[PDB]
Design a protein around this ligand. Structure first.
Ligand code: OLC
Ligand code: OLC
Ligand code: OLC
Ligand code: OLC
Ligand code: OLC
Ligand code: XTK
Ligand code: MHA
Ligand code: NA
Ligand code: NA
Length: 285
């Protein structure tokens, strides 16, 4: 019966991996093989797609084996690397959504300046800075063991190469969550709502035709959907992560894991969402 669950979950995880990996390669292949999709925003989309791709190839396969076997098979170093890449992908994603919100705000409010000043190369530089800072804030604290808790349970997990539970002290949990999630999430939401407001005002009345503005706003809508779904997928985990560092009995471990898998599931959603945008649909066809 445990073999039926092992075999059953194994196959379900293979399909999740295939969906995340294939989905996010297509998105990147759609963008790179099509003139229409060579926009600055879609270079920022490529960063999200890269983060979702790392999740599909490195994070989810290691995670699947932990869920199905109930122990960590890959030793203490790969536990630490796995955790660092997991943290990196979430951080780079939410900061990239924050860059997209800000970019688009400046694009609608100063289209004249924006278009003379922003270039394809300058977008890549911003993306690099995001991933470089994300890697700093992600890898450094994990390398330095700033996250470790002093409880016997925690210490036993650290002595055991078979335990890869990210048991953390409250200082690290609150601080890392603020820098890597809550701050960029709040900036993204605040700025996106203003973009929504300003787009909404421009159609109501730019010299631009009203039908051209509606085509601009369909693309803006895709981004807000990605933004909204990212929030739904990750905000539960991060709220529960805080509750769990204050009291471990308030959140059972299996429930913690379920919330985590809702987060990983976001990596599968974006290609499917991008599929319903008009230009991306043609490209996939
Ligand atoms: C999705 C876009 C939706 C943006 C909507 C309104 C901003 C209008 C001004 C935007 C001008 C820049 C559009 C862009 O994303 O970059 C194109 C760049 O010229 C490629 O080389
Ligand atoms: C290029 C760096 C500029 C930084 C972004 C500034 C403002 C964006 C958010 C302000 C919206 C509130 C109204
Ligand atoms: C630039 C990188 C930014 C990354 C974000 C900053 C991370 C640093 C946070 C804490 C370090 C200190 C760790 C040791 C502190 C122990 C505090 C403590 O005792 O807290 C709870 C207790 O362990 C029961 O859960
Ligand atoms: C609960 C999630 C909270 C987090 C939220 C993150 C920020 C997202 C911001 C705006 C929503 C984007 C979608 C806006 C769509 C407006 C389109 C519209 O006008 O309505 C239907 C359309 O007319 C039919 O053709
Ligand atoms: C009269 C109703 C017609 C409304 C038509 C406007 C359609 C969509 C607005 C997109 C803004 C979403 C912004 C999300 C942040 C980027
Ligand atoms: C800054 C940052 C980014 C992403 C995070 O969680 C992502 C989640 O997928 C982690 N999964 C494992 C628990 C399996 C490592 C956390 C957790 C903490 C804590 N404490 N800090 C994080
Ligand atoms: N066997 C190894 O290569 C590494 N070991 C030790 C470690 O990961 O620190 C794993 C184990 O003892 O189960
Ligand atoms: Na992601
Ligand atoms: Na361990």
């Amino acid at each position: 019966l445990s073999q039926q669950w092992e075999a059953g979950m194994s196959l379900l995880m293979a399909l999740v991996v295939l969906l995340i990996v294939a989905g996010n390669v297509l998105v990147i292949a759609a963008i790179g093989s099509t003139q229409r999709l060579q926009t600055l925003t879609n270079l920022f989309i490529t960063s999200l797609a890269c983060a979702d791709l790392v999740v599909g190839l490195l994070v989810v396969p290691f995670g699947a084996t932990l869920v199905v076997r109930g122990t960590w098979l890959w030793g203490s170093f790969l536990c630490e690397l796995w955790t660092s890449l997991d943290v990196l992908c979430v951080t780079a994603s939410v900061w990239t959504l924050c860059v997209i919100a800000i970019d688009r705000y400046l694009a609608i409010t100063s289209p004249f300046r924006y278009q003379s000043l922003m270039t394809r190369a300058r977008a890549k530089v911003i993306i690099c800075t995001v991933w470089a800072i994300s890697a700093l804030v992600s890898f450094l604290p994990i390398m330095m063991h700033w996250w470790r808790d002093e409880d016997p349970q925690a210490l036993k997990c650290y002595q055991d190469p078979g335990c890869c539970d990210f048991v953390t002290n409250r200082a690290y949990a609150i601080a890392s969550s603020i820098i890597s999630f809550y701050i960029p999430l709040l900036i993204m939401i605040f700025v996106a709502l203003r973009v929504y407001r300003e787009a909404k005002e421009q159609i109501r009345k730019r010299k631009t035709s009203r039908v051209m503005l509606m085509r601009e706003h369909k693309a803006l809508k895709t981004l807000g959907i990605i933004m909204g779904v990212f929030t739904l997928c990750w905000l539960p985990f991060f709220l529960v992560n805080i509750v769990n560092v204050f009291n471990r009995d308030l959140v059972p471990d299996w429930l913690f894991v379920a919330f985590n898998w809702l987060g990983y599931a976001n990596s599968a959603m974006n290609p499917i969402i991008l599929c319903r945008s008009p230009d991306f649909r043609k490209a996939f066809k």
